[PDB]
Design an enzyme around this catalytic site. Structure first.
Site, PDB file in Angstrom:
ATOM      1  N   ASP A 124      96.567  41.041  -8.822  1.00 47.33           N
ATOM      2  CA  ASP A 124      95.498  40.546 -10.025  1.00 47.33           C
ATOM      3  C   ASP A 124      95.246  39.269  -9.833  1.00 47.33           C
ATOM      4  O   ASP A 124      94.546  38.767  -8.612  1.00 47.33           O
ATOM      5  CB  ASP A 124      96.364  40.403 -11.183  1.00 47.33           C
ATOM      6  CG  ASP A 124      95.854  40.477 -12.696  1.00 47.33           C
ATOM      7  OD1 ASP A 124      95.388  41.356 -13.278  1.00 47.33           O
ATOM      8  OD2 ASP A 124      95.800  39.301 -13.354  1.00 47.33           O
ATOM      9  N   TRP A 125      95.181  38.394 -10.844  1.00 49.45           N
ATOM     10  CA  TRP A 125      94.773  36.942 -10.518  1.00 49.45           C
ATOM     11  C   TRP A 125      95.316  36.340  -9.349  1.00 49.45           C
ATOM     12  O   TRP A 125      94.734  35.222  -9.089  1.00 49.45           O
ATOM     13  CB  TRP A 125      94.478  36.030 -12.033  1.00 49.45           C
ATOM     14  CG  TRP A 125      93.463  36.246 -12.888  1.00 49.45           C
ATOM     15  CD1 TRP A 125      93.253  37.063 -13.972  1.00 49.45           C
ATOM     16  CD2 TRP A 125      92.062  35.794 -12.375  1.00 49.45           C
ATOM     17  NE1 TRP A 125      92.048  36.938 -14.304  1.00 49.45           N
ATOM     18  CE2 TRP A 125      91.308  35.926 -13.598  1.00 49.45           C
ATOM     19  CE3 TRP A 125      91.779  34.605 -11.521  1.00 49.45           C
ATOM     20  CZ2 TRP A 125      89.839  35.601 -13.488  1.00 49.45           C
ATOM     21  CZ3 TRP A 125      90.577  34.088 -11.517  1.00 49.45           C
ATOM     22  CH2 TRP A 125      89.603  34.678 -12.534  1.00 49.45           C
ATOM     23  N   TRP A 175      92.445  46.569 -22.076  1.00 44.69           N
ATOM     24  CA  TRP A 175      93.332  45.554 -21.657  1.00 44.69           C
ATOM     25  C   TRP A 175      93.044  44.210 -22.249  1.00 44.69           C
ATOM     26  O   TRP A 175      93.625  43.568 -23.008  1.00 44.69           O
ATOM     27  CB  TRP A 175      93.463  45.366 -20.112  1.00 44.69           C
ATOM     28  CG  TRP A 175      93.683  44.301 -19.155  1.00 44.69           C
ATOM     29  CD1 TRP A 175      92.970  43.221 -19.116  1.00 44.69           C
ATOM     30  CD2 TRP A 175      95.134  44.136 -18.594  1.00 44.69           C
ATOM     31  NE1 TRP A 175      93.830  42.263 -18.463  1.00 44.69           N
ATOM     32  CE2 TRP A 175      95.155  42.804 -18.051  1.00 44.69           C
ATOM     33  CE3 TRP A 175      96.108  44.909 -18.616  1.00 44.69           C
ATOM     34  CZ2 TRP A 175      96.207  42.308 -17.520  1.00 44.69           C
ATOM     35  CZ3 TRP A 175      97.151  44.640 -17.825  1.00 44.69           C
ATOM     36  CH2 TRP A 175      97.157  43.236 -17.022  1.00 44.69           C
ATOM     37  N   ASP A 260      97.178  52.631 -11.655  1.00 44.08           N
ATOM     38  CA  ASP A 260      96.606  51.541 -12.214  1.00 44.08           C
ATOM     39  C   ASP A 260      95.207  51.968 -12.586  1.00 44.08           C
ATOM     40  O   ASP A 260      94.333  52.464 -11.690  1.00 44.08           O
ATOM     41  CB  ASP A 260      96.686  50.257 -11.434  1.00 44.08           C
ATOM     42  CG  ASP A 260      95.965  48.963 -12.129  1.00 44.08           C
ATOM     43  OD1 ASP A 260      95.539  49.066 -13.144  1.00 44.08           O
ATOM     44  OD2 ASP A 260      95.616  48.133 -10.876  1.00 44.08           O
ATOM     45  N   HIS A 289      99.646  48.716 -12.752  1.00 44.64           N
ATOM     46  CA  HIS A 289      99.092  47.424 -12.272  1.00 44.64           C
ATOM     47  C   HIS A 289     100.033  46.559 -11.736  1.00 44.64           C
ATOM     48  O   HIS A 289      99.627  45.803 -10.875  1.00 44.64           O
ATOM     49  CB  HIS A 289      98.153  46.939 -13.544  1.00 44.64           C
ATOM     50  CG  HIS A 289      97.574  45.760 -13.078  1.00 44.64           C
ATOM     51  ND1 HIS A 289      96.374  45.755 -12.416  1.00 44.64           N
ATOM     52  CD2 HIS A 289      97.477  44.572 -13.743  1.00 44.64           C
ATOM     53  CE1 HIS A 289      95.687  44.506 -12.350  1.00 44.64           C
ATOM     54  NE2 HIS A 289      96.451  43.693 -13.297  1.00 44.64           N
TER      55      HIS A 289
END
Length: 310
Positions: A124-125, A175, A260, A289
């Site tokens: 992710d980030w 999300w 995901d 995720h």
């Protein structure tokens, strides 16, 4: 200078499966008076350092099942909490958070601790940001462990890294709606929705950092930066594509969480082509995720892959 608030230490008293001691830095260059929390586990003189970057809307707590596998292998594990999350201080204005503000914090952290022989662990980030760090000092990076993430490039150069924003409706759109719209955002309930296997204890650990909405400016801003990429981010992520395709010569291990809706196989296969030398990915059928929630397996397999090359 940068108005921030700090989460009362009491909020972390009863954490589940989190016995790691806190380490803080409040003297970063560019981040005056802001205190950053990081975990530094295993042998601090280890040749190998695993740098574990978290994403939205988590904290280092997310690597709690990977940490000990890495540490038992003889490595030094570093897992920082981004400003706005976990135990680090949280600027109060969403405007203070930018791609570069978090990117620079990371370069600052790496310089400060003088980390070398880094195995980058992203998702992710943590990957949006992290995949853009090796090109700034390649000599310090040696391996990469990539879980569901990609680069925030422009829609044209890489349509796979933009498409998930708009479709499907129960994917990034859901999300983001869940994150930036409620006025009473409860991160424990959000987590239990997006990570169905979490127990109630684990779920509450992700809400621990935010006693009330005033503490969640950073939480609100991440989703919006995915959706509205500022110029520097596009230029930065585009030049990193070039880095992974022609400059990277390290060992790479990829793990994909198959359930995901956001950054699954339609985003991962394309990433895999861009990273020079990336091998067959380990597909984890029951993972969403947050692949880290099935981390012990990912951590073991990766060290098993990297060993069969030393």
């Amino acid at each position: 200078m940068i108005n921030a608030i700090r989460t009362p230490d009491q909020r972390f008293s009863n954490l589940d499966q989190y016995p790691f001691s806190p380490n803080y830095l409040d003297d970063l260059p560019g981040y005056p008076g802001l205190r950053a929390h990081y975990l530094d586990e295993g042998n601090s003189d280890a040749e190998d350092v695993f740098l574990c970057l978290h994403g939205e809307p988590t904290w280092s707590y997310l690597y709690r099942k990977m940490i000990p596998v890495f540490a038992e292998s003889g490595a030094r594990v570093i897992a920082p909490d981004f400003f706005g999350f976990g135990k680090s201080d949280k600027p109060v204005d969403e405007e203070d958070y930018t791609f570069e503000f978090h990117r620079n914090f990371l370069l600052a952290l790496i310089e400060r601790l003088d980390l070398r022989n880094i195995t980058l662990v992203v998702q992710d980030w943590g990957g949006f940001l992290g995949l853009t760090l090796p090109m700034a000092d390649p000599s310090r990076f040696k391996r990469l462990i990539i879980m569901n993430a990609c680069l925030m490039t422009d829609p044209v150069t890489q349509p796979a890294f933009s498409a998930f924003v708009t479709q499907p409706a129960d994917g990034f759109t859901a999300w983001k709606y869940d994150l930036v719209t409620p006025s009473d955002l409860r991160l424990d309930q959000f987590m239990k929705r997006w990570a169905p296997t979490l127990t109630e204890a684990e779920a509450s650990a992700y809400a621990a950092p935010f006693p009330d909405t005033s503490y969640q400016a950073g939480v609100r801003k991440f989703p919006k930066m995915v959706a509205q990429r500022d110029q520097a981010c596009i230029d930065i992520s585009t030049e990193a594509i070039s880095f992974w395709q022609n400059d990277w010569n390290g060992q790479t291990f990829m793990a994909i969480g198959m359930k995901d809706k956001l950054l699954g196989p339609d985003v991962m296969y394309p990433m895999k082509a861009l990273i020079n030398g990336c091998p067959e990915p380990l597909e984890i059928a029951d993972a969403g995720h947050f692949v880290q929630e099935f981390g012990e397996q990912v951590a073991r397999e990766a060290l098993k892959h990297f060993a069969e090359t030393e």
